[PDB]
Design a protein around this nucleic acid. Structure first.
Ligand SMILES: [Mg+2]
Length: 142
DNA sequence: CCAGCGTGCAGC
DNA sequence: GCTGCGCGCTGG
């Protein structure tokens, strides 16, 4: 399953091969514009390339990097705990994990697994992608 | 200048 | 069902 590239350029389209990275991106996008969040995301992932590294980080350090995005202490703590659970808790869908709600879960189900036909998003950007998928999947041969 | 907002979520 | 978290951007 390869989710198609869309005219809406969701960052999920490029991150789907690594579900942890895609989920971290959703967290970075919580009430934060992609224009701001996505550049900080690459800096984050250079320092913390995997859940293994993030799980062991001090959230106060992560917070310093997240500062210009807002929600910096909240999300720093989320990222550490989410990363821990990702690796050590039994889960089938990531909504079961701390920090991931319907938006992150719907992202995972559209991009990381082939469940897009079952997903009913309530996030505007995801709905633009998901609507467009229904309208074009025949042409794309999905 | 400055009110509103951005691909939310947990805790309550 | 509501609230705290939160910055820089955005555009009048
Ligand atoms: Mg969750």
């Amino acid at each position: 399953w390869t989710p198609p590239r869309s005219p809406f350029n969701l960052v999920q389209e490029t991150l789907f091969h690594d579900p942890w990275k895609l989920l971290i991106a959703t967290i970075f996008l919580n009430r934060t514009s992609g224009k701001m969040a996505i550049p900080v995301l690459w800096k984050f992932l250079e320092k913390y390339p995997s859940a293994e590294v993030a799980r062991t980080a001090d959230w106060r350090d992560v917070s310093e990097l997240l500062k210009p995005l807002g929600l910096y202490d909240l999300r720093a703590k989320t990222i550490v705990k989410f990363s821990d659970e990702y690796l050590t808790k039994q889960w089938k869908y990531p909504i079961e994990l701390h920090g991931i709600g319907k938006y992150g879960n719907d992202s995972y189900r559209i991009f990381c697994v082939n469940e897009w036909k079952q997903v009913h998003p309530e996030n505007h950007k995801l709905n633009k992608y998901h609507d467009w998928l229904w309208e074009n999947h025949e042409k794309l041969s999905l």
